[PDB]
Amino acid sequence: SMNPPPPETSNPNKPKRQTNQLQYLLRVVLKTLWKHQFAWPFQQPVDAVKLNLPDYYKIIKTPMDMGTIKKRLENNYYWNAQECIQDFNTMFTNCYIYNKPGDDIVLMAEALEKLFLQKINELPTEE
Ligand SMILES: CC(=O)Nc1cccc(-c2ccc3c(c2)[C@H](NC(=O)OC(C)C)C[C@H](C)N3C(C)=O)c1
């Protein structure tokens, strides 16, 4: 089995905007998570071919990862901050679907999620 194509990251057919919340999501939330010790398995799509995981995309039908999120923010792909927050949540939930609770990668994801949740509690005001 092949990997699926990665998620879309740009779309000229959607209107674009910059907002305080979107800027915060890139400059604070994504930046902080990206630099974390345990970021790296989450910094690009799961390469199921390289990892020899033929069942990964048999269950995970909405893949998401921080590399995709980073590009989406850079490309003004999201109009509303909650679209981006949803993508982070999807990334965490995928990890907790495919992987057994307590396993190494799950512990890594939970540490990242903790930091994510702290940063989201400090989201700036809406326009
Ligand atoms: C040495 C090595 O593991 N090099 C490597 C290279 C690139 C990506 C990944 C990589 C990418 C994604 C994931 C995993 C590994 C996890 N398997 C695993 O040993 O995780 C360790 C980091 C505890 C499996 C799981 C499918 N996963 C996620 C995020 O749900 C791994």
Curated annotation (Swiss-Prot):
Location within or outside the cell: Nucleus; Chromosome
Cystine connections: none
Tissues expressing this chain: Ubiquitously expressed.
Domain Bromo, chain residue ranges per copy: 17-123
UniProt modification remark: Phosphorylation by CK2 disrupt the intramolecular binding between the bromo domain 2 and the NPS region and promotes binding between the NPS and the BID regions, leading to activate the protein and promote binding to acetylated histones. In absence of phosphorylation, BRD4 does not localize to p53/TP53 target gene promoters, phosphorylation promoting recruitment to p53/TP53 target promoters.
Site residues (Acetylated histone binding), renumbered to this chain: N99
Positions bearing the Glycyl lysine isopeptide (Lys-Gly) (interchain with G-Cter in SUMO2) cross-link: K58
Known function: Chromatin reader protein that recognizes and binds acetylated histones and plays a key role in transmission of epigenetic memory across cell divisions and transcription regulation. Remains associated with acetylated chromatin throughout the entire cell cycle and provides epigenetic memory for postmitotic G1 gene transcription by preserving acetylated chromatin status and maintaining high-order chromatin structure. During interphase, plays a key role in regulating the transcription of signal-inducible genes by associating with the P-TEFb complex and recruiting it to promoters.
Clinical disorder: Cornelia de Lange syndrome 6: A form of Cornelia de Lange syndrome, a clinically heterogeneous developmental disorder associated with malformations affecting multiple systems. It is characterized by facial dysmorphisms, abnormal hands and feet, growth delay, cognitive retardation, hirsutism, gastroesophageal dysfunction and cardiac, ophthalmologic and genitourinary anomalies. CDLS6 inheritance is autosomal dominant. A chromosomal aberration involving BRD4 is found in a rare, aggressive, and lethal carcinoma arising in midline organs of young people. Translocation t(15;19)(q14;p13) with NUTM1 which produces a BRD4-NUTM1 fusion protein.
Miscellaneous comment: JQ1, a thieno-triazolo-1,4-diazepine derivative, and I-BET, a benzodiazepine derivative, have been tested on tumors with success. Treatment with GSK1210151A (I-BET151, a I-BET derivative) has strong effets on mixed lineage leukemia and promotes myeloid differentiation and leukemia stem-cell depletion.
Entry text on domains: The NET domain mediates interaction with a number of chromatin proteins involved in transcription regulation (NSD3, JMJD6, CHD4, GLTSCR1 and ATAD5). The C-terminal (CTD) region mediates interaction and recruitment of CDK9 and CCNT1 subunits of the P-TEFb complex. It is also required for maintenance of higher-order chromatin structure.
Quaternary structure annotation from Swiss-Prot or TrEMBL: Interacts with p53/TP53; the interaction is direct. Interacts (via CTD region) with CDK9 and CCNT1, acting as an associated component of P-TEFb complex. Interacts with RELA (when acetylated at 'Lys-310'). Interacts (via NET domain) with NSD3, CHD4, BICRA and ATAD5. The interaction with BICRA bridges BRD4 to the GBAF complex. Interacts (via NET domain) with JMJD6 (via JmjC and N-terminal domains); the interaction is stronger in presence of ssRNA and recruits JMJD6 on distal enhancers. Interacts with NSD3. Interacts with NIPBL.
Family, per entry: Belongs to the BET family.
UniProt protein name: Bromodomain-containing protein 4
Gene: BRD4
Entire-sequence positions represented here: 44 to 168 of 1362
